[PDB]
Design a protein around this nucleic acid. Structure first.
Ligand code: CH1
Ligand code: MG
Length: 977
DNA sequence: GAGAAAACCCAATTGT
RNA sequence: AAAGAAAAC
DNA sequence: ACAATTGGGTTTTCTTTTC
């Protein structure tokens, strides 16, 4: 639509609004006014922007000049121009607030003044000044009254927002003053946008060469800072000269931030450069995004929104604090709106060309400015002024990419200096205060930085557009769930941290997940050397990850921290700080604990031992009674694991989840030797997971009796387990073929297990191909070290066979629903429309596939993605219902996606809630509601007759439900266990 | 400054 | 951006 | 029809990309 430069100049004029100094923007408008082609292709919004800026300045003469230019060249005044005129009259006093001209002209012309006060976004001060200038003539006008906040009246979300009920809303263990000073610490952390963490690499006793390298590095850093300041001044002068030469420039974009801050940015980006450095484009995009992240925070400091946030947050913490009370207990967003909330007013992101040009300019500045003497080993008087970073191209790849390499001496200086400090950005670290409530798609999560509501790659905006144009009460439960997942307080387990750091700083233990040092790689000649370099690179790449996660664990060791949460486009909720969270590896889950603990109660130690047995991986198919018996039998190994983790018989290393098993052995040993095990405060999360969840949801949509009996929707004394049935069938087939001398069938004995066929049997209901199942079985066979690696490939072809022998008596109505969904998605995409639906909790979901280069939907991708995305949206709705009705009863609830975590005391309660919020979820006609929504959405147009008829008879051919009572899932024991 | 690891699949979509 | 690996559902 | 494309879905992270 709009041109690149036409979109670019609007960002320019908004940027001149952002940092004042506005006559350069006015001068550029005058230069465009000089030549009639130069003011051509200029949109009206840039005139509105500069008028509003002069209104903020209070200059009426320039306002009238821009008005005259608006009536020139055929442009028409709109509402923002009258808002700017009334704002100028608000700042001034002449004409006594347009007695004679402006409001009378507006009323005569026919534009509505209620739309002036309400529709278009203005800040509170500008709204007040325009309100005063309107009150100059006809003072009897009043603003339309603020309505009481709307409450969602959806049937699934009626109980959570009904006042007539008993609620037990939990409170943090932290007093209000401590919470307030932690808010201050997080604010100071976000203001200086990066955090320094001491590295958990082995500290070395310093030597003379270490001092010499560090002194040289400090002198070089000071010289680089001076050089970057000179380069930034020269760039700012030349770009200001370009603005005064009447062309586009990025000079206000450099004037967004202080020169100190930009030089500190460039130096800290240089510090975290790889040894074989990052490409030009990624580094440029990082520089621009980091510049925007600092600009938002700086704008909130200057604009005064930080003090408003401070006041509101100190009034807000009374709901969460232990020693404070609210007059009526409410949900966190309801209390956030009850205390009159400020406008968020976070800046919308710039157009992508401006961002790219800013990044390349900053990167080329860093390449050009910083330099070093050539030789450090020989200190001659004549040393060549050599660059620190080099631009090289890459020959191997198809499309050549620029790579910035460090100068090779700098690598040895960084190795010998051995700086003990890593640097993180503030958004990649857990928050030190409770996060802001999710009150809108725009507000929530971090304090000063904007966070998306839906995680999207490549800047797809149709998800956010669906979330904005929905009815506002539809997202409430979703928002509530996200806030509920943010308010959980976490802490780091100390003993596990000491053990992992002992293994990490010493010789690493790759069996237990701890990466080994850069040494201890293994060491026809070229083949061996290439293998050693490849394995050494893999070892180094793993140990860097471990260094970052363990450094954050060391930093957050004596702290209480929070993880704000987010969604993807389906409804599924992930935490925002990436390095150290509970959706991670075994070590990440072992390090983490609830900061608030609850007493165990009668069923705390019982569920704790059940959780431990589930962690060891042994006894999966047994009832819970035999899980308890197994826990009671192996108690000596539990106590020896807890007492001597590394100098004992080391039974916990044999567990399927070994570090989590060690943490639970520590918790159990603390519980059993206590004087009163029942009144013991436990901080360890206990897990409950559902068996074959996508199959559970297919069975609940179909009401299939055999399907519901298959995935534990019908109660039984023993668990039912689909994958160990399919494994038994394939083992029967294998023995039959291996009796006939089939070599691939012969070399598989003891190698067909649940884990081999698990993902394939899980995935046949999502339309897997035989090729995808082959890669699944291949990756599961490569992990078994005992199995012959020469015969993996043929084994894979023998195992896509005999597993796809599930043709009859396996998931009939499940594949009927799957077929109807796939045909529905195929025929929706055949007309050219992406598949949209609404979650039963009200969340709109759209599929961002559109593989065109993005103009036309990719039919294959849409039909393959619709069954998993629909079932995943349903399980997210299940999770959010369970979370909300657990909040109403006082439960600390976090979710790892079919896996629900709580204290050991509340597990039964959560189970009850879980089953109820399944039953209420699928009692709704989800198939019928989806069918009529898709008929309304895609089959309501008169232009296409036959296509809409075929899609309508496809959509109205919904599969009929079977005969299964959903209430009986409330009686099920192994539904979630 | 300058060439035997080996990838092996095999049927539904899509630009042409 | 492409490749070598790793983790979670 | 012909040859190229593709392979059930989602989320996160690391050091290297000519030897
Ligand atoms: N590669 C994939 C694709 C989808 N899911 C989705 O997560 C759901 C449950 O996650 P799992 O950990 O695999 O648990 P189950 O399928 O229920 O198997 P189990 O009985 O052992 O818990 C199933 C499926 O809808 C998954 O875990 N892994
Ligand atoms: Mg599960």
């Amino acid at each position: 639509q709009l041109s690149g430069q036409q979109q670019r100049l609007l960002a320019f004029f908004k940027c001149c609004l952002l940092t004042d100094q506005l006559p350069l923007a006015h001068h550029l408008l005058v230069v465009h006014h000089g030549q009639r082609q130069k003011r051509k292709l200029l949109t009206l919004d840039m005139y509105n922007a500069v008028m509003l800026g002069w209104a903020r300045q209070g200059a009426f003469k320039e306002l009238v000049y821009v008005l005259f230019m608006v009536k020139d060249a055929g442009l028409t005044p709109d509402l923002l121009s009258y808002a700017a005129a009334l704002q100028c009259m608000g700042r001034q006093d002449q004409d006594a607030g347009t007695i004679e001209r402006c409001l009378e002209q507006m009323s005569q012309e026919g534009l509505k003044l209620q739309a002036l006060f309400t529709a278009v976004l203005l800040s509170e001060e500008d709204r007040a000044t325009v309100l005063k200038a309107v009150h100059k003539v006809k003072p009897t006008f009043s603003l339309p009254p603020q309505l009481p906040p709307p409450v969602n009246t959806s049937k699934l979300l009626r109980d959570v927002y009904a006042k007539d009920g008993r609620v037990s809303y939990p409170k943090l263990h932290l007093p209000l003053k401590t919470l307030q000073c932690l808010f201050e610490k997080q604010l100071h952390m976000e203001l200086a946008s990066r955090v320094c963490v001491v590295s958990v690499e082995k500290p070395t006793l310093p030597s003379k060469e270490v001092k010499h390298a560090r002194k040289t590095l400090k002198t070089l850093r000071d010289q680089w800072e001076k050089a970057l300041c000179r380069a930034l001044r020269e760039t700012k002068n030349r770009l200001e000269r370009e603005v005064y030469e009447g062309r586009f420039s990025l000079y206000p974009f450099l004037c967004l931030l202080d020169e100190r801050e930009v030089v500190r940015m460039l130096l800290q980006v240089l510090q975290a450069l790889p040894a074989q450095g990052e490409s030009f484009t990624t580094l440029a995009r990082e520089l621009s995004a980091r510049t925007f992240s600092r600009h938002v925070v700086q704008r909130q400091r200057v604009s005064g929104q930080v003090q408003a946030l401070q006041n509101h947050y100190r009034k807000y913490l009374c709901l969460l604090a232990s020693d404070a009370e609210v007059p009526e207990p409410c949900l966190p967003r309801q209390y956030w709106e009850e205390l009159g909330a400020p406008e968020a007013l976070r800046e919308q992101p710039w157009p992508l060309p401006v961002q790219m040009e800013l990044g390349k300019l900053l990167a080329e500045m860093l390449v050009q400015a910083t330099q070093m003497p050539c030789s450090l080993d020989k200190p001659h008087r004549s040393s060549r002024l050599v660059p620190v970073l080099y631009h090289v191209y890459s020959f191997r790849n198809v499309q050549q990419i620029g790579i910035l390499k460090p100068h090779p001496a700098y690598v040895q200086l960084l190795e010998k200096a051995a700086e003990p400090t890593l640097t993180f950005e503030a958004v990649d670290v857990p928050m030190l205060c409770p996060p802001l409530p999710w009150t809108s798609p725009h507000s929530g999560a971090f304090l000063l930085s904007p966070t998306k509501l839906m995680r999207t790659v490549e800047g797809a905006t149709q998800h956010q557009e669906l979330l904005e144009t929905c009815p506002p009460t539809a997202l409430h439960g979703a928002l509530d769930a996200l806030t509920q997942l943010g308010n959980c307080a976490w802490r780091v387990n100390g003993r596990v941290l000491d053990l992992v750091l002992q293994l990490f700083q010493a010789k690493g233990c790759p069996q237990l997940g701890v990466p080994a040092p850069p040494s201890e790689a293994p060491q026809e000649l070229r083949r061996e050397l290439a293998h050693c370099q490849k394995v050494a690179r893999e070892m180094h790449s793993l140990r860097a990850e471990a260094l970052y996660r363990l450094s954050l664990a060391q930093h957050l060791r004596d702290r209480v921290f929070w993880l704000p949460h987010n969604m993807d486009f389906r409804g599924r909720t992930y935490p925002c700080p990436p390095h150290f969270n509970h959706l991670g590896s075994d070590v990440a889950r072992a390090l983490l604990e609830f900061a608030q603990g609850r007493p165990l109660g009668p069923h705390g130690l019982d569920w704790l031992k059940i959780h431990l047995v589930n962690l060891t991986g042994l006894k999966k198919r047994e009832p819970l009674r035999k899980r308890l018996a197994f826990a009671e039998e192996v108690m000596d190994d539990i106590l020896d694991s807890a007492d001597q983790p590394l100098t004992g018989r080391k039974w916990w290393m044999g567990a399927e989840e070994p570090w989590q098993t060690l943490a639970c052995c520590m918790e159990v040993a603390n519980a059993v030797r206590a004087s009163d095990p029942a009144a013991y405060v436990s901080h360890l999360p206990v897990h409950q997971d559902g068996s074959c969840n996508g199959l559970q949801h297919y069975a609940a949509l179909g009401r299939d009796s055999v399907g519901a009996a298959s995935v534990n929707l019908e109660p039984s004394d023993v668990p039912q387990d689909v994958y160990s049935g399919v494994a038994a069938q394939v083992e029967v087939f294998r023995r039959q073929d291996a009796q006939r001398g089939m070599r691939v069938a012969q070399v598989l004995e003891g190698f067909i297990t649940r884990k081999v066929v698990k993902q394939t049997v899980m995935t046949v209901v999502y339309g897997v191909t035989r090729y995808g199942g082959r890669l699944q079985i291949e990756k599961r066979l490569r992990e078994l070290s005992d199995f012959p690696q020469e015969f993996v490939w043929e084994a894979s072809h023998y195992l896509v066979r005999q597993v796809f022998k599930s043709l009859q008596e396996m998931f009939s109505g499940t594949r009927a629903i799957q077929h109807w969904l796939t045909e529905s998605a195929r025929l929706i995409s055949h007309m050219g429309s992406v598949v949209e639906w609404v979650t039963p909790l009200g969340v709109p979901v759209i599929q961002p596939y559109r593989l065109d280069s993005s103009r036309k939907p990719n039919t294959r991708k849409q039909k393959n993605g619709f069954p998993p995305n629909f079932i995943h949206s349903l399980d997210s709705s299940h999770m959010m219902l369970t979370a909300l009705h657990c909040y109403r009863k006082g439960l600390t609830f976090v979710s790892v996606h079919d896996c629900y975590w709580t204290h050991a005391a509340d597990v039964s309660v959560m189970n009850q809630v879980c089953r109820e919020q399944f039953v209420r979820l699928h009692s709704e006609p989800i198939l019928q509601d989806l069918s009529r929504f898709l008929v309304k959405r895609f089959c309501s147009e008169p232009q296409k007759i036959l296509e809409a008829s075929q899609l309508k008879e496809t959509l109205q051919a919904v599969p009929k439900p079977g005969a299964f009572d959903l209430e009986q899932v409330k009686r099920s024991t192994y539904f979630f266990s």
